[PDB]
């Protein structure tokens, strides 16, 4: 029982980690395109031009 519970914990940690990695790629792309550069993409860098 404890090993099944531990494996469930590991599985959910991997899923949350993958979600966090996708958010991390979003954050790095926004640093490279909203901070380092002036993007023309509408609502990629918040509301407005």
């Amino acid at each position: 029982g404890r090993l099944q519970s531990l494996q469930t914990y590991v599985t959910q940690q991997l899923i949350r980690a993958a979600e966090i990695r996708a958010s991390a790629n979003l954050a790095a792309t926004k640093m490279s395109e909203c901070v380092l550069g002036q993007s023309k993409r509408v609502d990629f860098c918040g509301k407005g031009y």
């Binding site: 531990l6 590991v10 940690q13 790095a28 640093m31 002036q38």
Partner: protein
């Protein structure tokens, strides 16, 4: 547990790979630049007050007011070992310091390698010409832009201090 195979090996490999991926995440976010840049305190910014975003040497923890509000408004032993992070908050604070120094001084031009000094008014004029706004509107309405900018900074300071609704996303 010896009779129950290699479960411990697989789980520890998975969790160590998780920690390595956390390190890769924070590095690929915050290693945008390799050259640490430093803000000159010479404030000829055309009236653009950057006090709540610049690094403040009045405090030894070298960051701004807003990041300090983000710290102070955001809040077992059976083998459950919390590993330490690789980059501390001070190191990524200095990376944000360098990025703010670059965006003040060189705008986008340090993204192609070396930094290139440009006065900040010309950066704003170029960013207006990027969105089709003719750059005369900047030069003819500079102090109103300074007022609206610094007032918006004060508004987001108050909206972070008196309201913690935009923080539970991290929680």
């Amino acid at each position: 547990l010896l009779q129950y195979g290699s479960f411990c090996t697989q789980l520890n490999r998975a969790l160590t790979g998780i920690a390595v991926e956390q390190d890769k995440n924070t590095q690929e976010v915050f290693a945008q630049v390799k050259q640490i840049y430093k803000t000159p305190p010479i404030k000829d910014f055309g009236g653009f007050n950057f006090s709540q975003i610049l690094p403040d040497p009045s405090k030894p923890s070298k960051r701004s007011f807003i990041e300090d509000l983000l710290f102070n408004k955001v809040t077992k032993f059976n083998g459950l070992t919390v590993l330490p992070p690789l980059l501390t908050d001070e190191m990524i604070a200095q990376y944000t310091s360098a990025l703010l120094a670059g965006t003040i001084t060189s705008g986008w031009t340090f993204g192609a390698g070396a930094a290139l000094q440009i006065p900040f008014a010309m950066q704003m004029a170029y960013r207006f010409n990027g969105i089709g706004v003719t750059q005369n509107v900047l030069y003819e309405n500079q102090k109103l832009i300074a007022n609206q900018f610094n007032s918006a900074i004060g508004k987001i300071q108050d909206s972070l201090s008196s309201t913690a609704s935009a923080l539970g996303k991290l929680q």
